[PDB]
Write a protein that binds this ligand. Structure first.
Ligand code: NA
Ligand code: NA
Ligand SMILES: [Pt+2]
Ligand SMILES: [Pt+2]
Ligand SMILES: [Pt+2]
Length: 128
């Protein structure tokens, strides 16, 4: 599924991301836009043997298990295929685990580079 910005905002907000650990909703929407272009099925297979999965491009070394990545920690306790679902719940829950495990949103490179310090509210502006 490829989400709209406002549909993704509403789905994220139902799952508690607005103001999660002091990161407003727009931050989360902005991160998804620049990680995956709102596509739940996005994958990026890396040269280090790891893969980035789903709408938030969560990586298979530390966070989810794809069975083929060296160094697997599986800290979200999920198969990476769960992060390719058309509903976002597993991705959102894993993203909250990532922040709970001592990370800011800096853990997402596209957040750092494309959202940090910008008018992130644009990504929710005009939405119900
Ligand atoms: Na994801
Ligand atoms: Na892992
Ligand atoms: Pt829901
Ligand atoms: Pt939830
Ligand atoms: Pt839900």
């Amino acid at each position: 599924k490829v989400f709209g910005r406002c549909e993704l905002a509403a789905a994220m907000k139902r799952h508690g991301l607005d103001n999660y650990r002091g990161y407003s909703l727009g931050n989360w929407v902005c991160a998804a836009k620049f990680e995956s272009n709102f596509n739940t099925q996005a994958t990026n297979r890396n040269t280090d043997g790891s893969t980035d999965y789903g709408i938030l491009q969560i990586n298979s070394r530390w966070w989810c298990n794809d069975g083929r990545t060296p160094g697997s920690r599986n800290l979200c306790n999920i198969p990476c295929s769960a992060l390719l679902s058309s509903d976002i719940t597993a991705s959102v829950n894993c993203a909250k685990k990532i922040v709970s495990d001592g990370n800011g949103m800096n853990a997402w490179v596209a957040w750092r580079n494309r959202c940090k310090g910008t008018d992130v509210q644009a990504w929710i502006r005009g939405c119900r």
